[PDB]
C-alpha cells in the first residue's frame, strides 16, 4: 500500500460528489501538499518555512471546517485559524503557547512549542477519527499514536514516524505529515459523503 494510492482512492470518492473554501490535498514526490503548499522539507528540498506555515494554516482551516460540519467540539484544545500563523489554545492551560508555524534556522535554537503544537493537533485529528469511525467498518488509513506523537504506516512499512522535529530527520517528519494529510483527505471524503 502506497500513500499515493491512498490519496487517489480518496480523490475518486471526492470527484463523484460542499464547503466554504476548497481544500485540495495531494502529493509532490515525498511531500504531502494542501492547496499547493508542501507540508515538510527534505535535505535536497529546503522548503521555506513560509510555505510550511501556509500548509499548516490550510490544514488547520480544513480540520476546523470538518469539526464544525460534524458538530464536534474538541477536548483539550481549540483550533485558531489564523492564515499562515495558525495555532491552538489549550483549554486547561491558558499559559501554553501552541504555534503551528515556525521561523527558519536550526532546531537547536528553538523551544518545543511548535512540536507541542503538532502533537496537540494530532490529538485533535485522532478525536476527529474517533467521531467518523463511531458506529460502518470505515477507518482512516494511518493509525495515530497521540501519546508518542507518531503516525504509523499501517499496512505499508508498518513503521512509526514522529510528527515532532526534535530528534527526528526531515525525511521522516515529512512522511509523518504526509500520512496525516492522507487521513484528513479520507476524512474529507467521508464527511462530504455522509453529510
UniProtKB/Swiss-Prot annotation:
Region of interest (Required for membrane-association), ranges: 173-195
Result of altering residue 173 to A: Decrease in membrane-association
Localization (cell): Mitochondrion; Nucleus; Cytoplasm
UniProt region (Evolutionary conserved domain (ECD)), positions on chain: 1-195
Source organism superkingdom: Eukaryota
Cross-link position per record: Glycyl lysine isopeptide (Lys-Gly) (interchain with G-Cter in ubiquitin): 150, 185
Record protein name field: Beclin-1-C 35 kDa
Source organism: Homo sapiens (Human)
Taxonomic lineage: Eukaryota, Metazoa, Chordata, Craniata, Vertebrata
Protein's gene: BECN1
Part of the whole protein covered: 248 to 447 of 450
Amino acid at each position: 500500500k502506497s500513500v499515493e494510492n491512498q490519496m487517489r482512492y480518496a480523490q475518486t470518492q471526492l470527484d463523484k460528489l460542499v464547503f466554504n473554501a476548497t481544500f485540495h490535498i495531494w502529493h509532490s514526490g515525498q511531500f504531502g501538499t494542501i492547496n499547493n503548499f508542501r507540508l515538510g522539507r527534505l535535505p535536497s528540498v529546503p522548503v521555506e518555512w513560509n510555505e510550511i506555515n501556509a500548509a499548516w494554516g490550510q490544514t488547520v482551516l480544513l480540520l476546523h471546517a470538518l469539526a464544525n460540519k460534524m458538530g464536534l467540539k474538541f477536548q483539550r484544545y481549540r483550533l485558531v485559524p489564523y492564515g499562515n500563523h495558525s495555532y491552538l489554545e489549550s483549554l486547561t492551560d491558558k499559559s501554553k503557547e501552541l504555534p503551528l508555524y515556525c521561523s527558519g534556522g536550526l532546531r537547536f535554537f528553538w523551544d518545543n512549542k511548535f512540536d507541542h503544537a503538532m502533537v496537540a493537533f494530532l490529538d485533535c485529528v485522532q478525536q476527529f477519527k474517533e467521531e467518523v469511525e463511531k458506529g460502518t467498518r470505515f477507518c482512516l488509513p494511518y493509525r495515530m499514536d497521540v501519546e508518542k506523537g507518531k503516525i504509523e504506516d499501517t499496512g505499508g512499512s508498518g513503521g512509526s514516524y514522529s510528527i515532532k522535529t526534535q530528534f527526528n530527520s526531515e525525511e521522516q517528519w515529512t512522511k509523518a505529515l504526509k500520512f496525516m494529510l492522507t487521513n484528513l483527505k479520507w476524512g474529507l471524503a467521508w464527511v462530504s459523503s455522509q453529510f
